[PDB]
């Protein structure tokens, strides 16, 4: 019951791969949910190099709606993976608790689930055992997909384990005998999750289990009058039993209902002595390789747009002056341009101190404020 700096407690839920338990940090009290896989039940290979490739592969998948994996702790008896913890529970428990939900919250959950499934598809991984019991909610009422790639072990063994182990959530292709299941299973399971969010009840649910498989093979499903016909047209286009007519990510993104309330951050792609001391090479001013009269016109335009009062003795010698808005006193400085070579020109700033007036505020910090607004306008 001790991994890293985390003691363990009770059991959060039951998983066919392994039991998921909660862990608590002994000092801070942070909660980390660790999935514990029994090696004696399922182990394809005992090579440590494949474990190293798994550690290299699974850690680099960061997404704001996919549950992040922290590390994979090896053990001669079990397999430990420390995932993050959420306090909202499973989606299916939320459906059983609250029944029917609003459409504006169901679309907000569905867009986040689709943005996680499309992220998994862009990283070439599918979640064949997808169901509302494998997606979670946080404290902020978002959606978190639990296991993105762990269903591959269920796919590796036999397809009969997929039908017998998960009789309710099973694709028509898998029960029809397709050995390899692709993203069409993800689209169908996301449609089942969307129907569960929109209606609360299951789309295909029979007491007799081969009758349930026959009803899954049947295209027809019950439609209530609560939902407007656009989203049930989307569900009919999305829940086709043949994968040629089943929708894609682009086919959902081109739909009218999906584009009503869409946050921009969901899709990453828009098209579909003791201490160390380090020296710094400081720069005096601005090295501009242009005509000096044009640089003087640029500085004049900048100090005109910054509302400064200025007078020139020489054309290159610019004494500017501004009155502060909140501070009653005024500050005085002087600009001068330098010729280091025939190509580039250096602009230099020189303040003059206040002679007799005990001015309020700080003279040198207001001198830095007379240039922190000027360098942003010049940007050179």
């Amino acid at each position, epitope marked *: 019951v001790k991994i890293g700096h985390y003691i363990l407690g009770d059991t959060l839920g039951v998983g066919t791969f392994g039991k998921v338990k909660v862990g608590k940090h002994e000092l801070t009290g942070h909660k980390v949910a660790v999935k514990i896989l029994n090696r004696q039940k399922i182990r394809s*290979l005992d090579v440590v190099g494949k474990i190293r*490739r798994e550690i290299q592969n699974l850690k680099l998948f960061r997404h704001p709606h996919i549950i992040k994996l922290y590390q994979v702790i090896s053990t001669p008896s079990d397999i430990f993976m420390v995932m993050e913890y959420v306090s909202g529970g499973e989606l299916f428990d939320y459906i059983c608790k609250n029944g029917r939900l609003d459409e504006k919250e169901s679309r907000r959950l569905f867009q986040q689930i689709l943005s996680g499934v499309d992220y998994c598809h862009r990283h*070439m991984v599918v979640h064949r055992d997808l169901k509302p019991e494998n997606v979670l909610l946080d404290a902020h009422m978002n959606a978190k997909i639990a296991d993105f790639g762990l269903s591959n072990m269920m796919s590796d063994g036999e397809f009969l384990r997929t039908s017998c182990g998960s009789p309710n959530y099973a694709a028509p292709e898998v029960i029809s005998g397709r050995l390899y299941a692709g993203p069409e299973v993800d689209i169908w399971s996301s449609g089942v999750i969307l129907y569960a969010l929109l209606c609360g009840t299951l789309p295909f649910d029979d007491d007799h289990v081969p009758t349930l498989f026959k009803k899954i093979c049947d295209g027809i499903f019950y439609t209530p009058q609560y939902l407007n016909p656009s989203v049930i047209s989307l569900l009919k286009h999305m829940l086709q039993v043949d994968p040629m007519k089943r929708a894609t990510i682009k086919d959902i993104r081109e739909h009218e209902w999906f584009k009503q309330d869409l946050p921009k951050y969901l899709f990453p792609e828009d098209p579909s002595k003791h201490q160390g001391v380090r020296k710094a090479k400081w720069h005096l001013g601005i090295r501009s390789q242009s005509r000096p009269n044009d640089i003087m016109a640029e500085v004049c335009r900048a100090i005109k747009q910054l509302d400064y009062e200025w007078k020139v003795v020489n054309p290159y010698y610019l004494r500017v002056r501004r009155k502060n808005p909140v501070t009653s006193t005024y500050s005085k400085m002087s600009l001068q341009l330098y010729q280091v070579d025939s190509r580039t020109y250096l602009l230099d700033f020189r303040s003059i101190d206040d002679e007799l007036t005990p001015r309020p505020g700080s003279h040198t910090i207001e001198f830095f404020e007379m240039c922190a607004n000027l360098i942003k306008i010049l940007a050179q």
Partner: antibody
Amino acid sequence: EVQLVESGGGLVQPGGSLRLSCAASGFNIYYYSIHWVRQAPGKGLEWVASIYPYSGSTSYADSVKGRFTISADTSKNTAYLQMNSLRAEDTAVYYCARYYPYFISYYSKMEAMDYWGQGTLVTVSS
Amino acid sequence: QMTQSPSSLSASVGDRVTITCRASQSVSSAVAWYQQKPGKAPKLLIYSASSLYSGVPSRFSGSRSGTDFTLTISSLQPEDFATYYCQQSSSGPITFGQGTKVEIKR
């Protein structure tokens, strides 16, 4: 129930444009990349074309670069290999094959070709 | 971008044969093997040169030794007389092998 039926083959005049299709029935063309290969009589396989509709990225061999434009229609699940300015060397049977780029296991990135078509025979002769 | 070069041999029924595939550059475990009967479609046997593709049973086996990919056929049935092809897809341009043919001993 996946069958890759080819069409548009036969005999062509050298210097003419040909467009053979691949009716992908049983799966969806938007996720998987349709790859064309060349099987000369007596020789082995030879990769010629590729199109991946999910990210919109294509691939080509070094010998047929910029001359055999590939096209994919996701509405009818077909793959159009529009060949242009063909030479006398390109005389073979053209197989159609889907491609599975996904992680089937946690450790093994599967990158093979699962399902193969019957292939039509094009003959180029003056 | 690279080339492949398998071997070529012939043996009897039930003999243990091997087919090498020397990769040119440094590649990963992304090498497949396609069995093509004469006048038929190339059937897939092993997809990543180490684990068996579902379908065809465990007679076909492959091992990985650096850049020398092997295909071992133990207990050769009298129906498995076809042409075998190496296939490298890790680089990005797909390059096939020269193709080895298995002839019966006479």
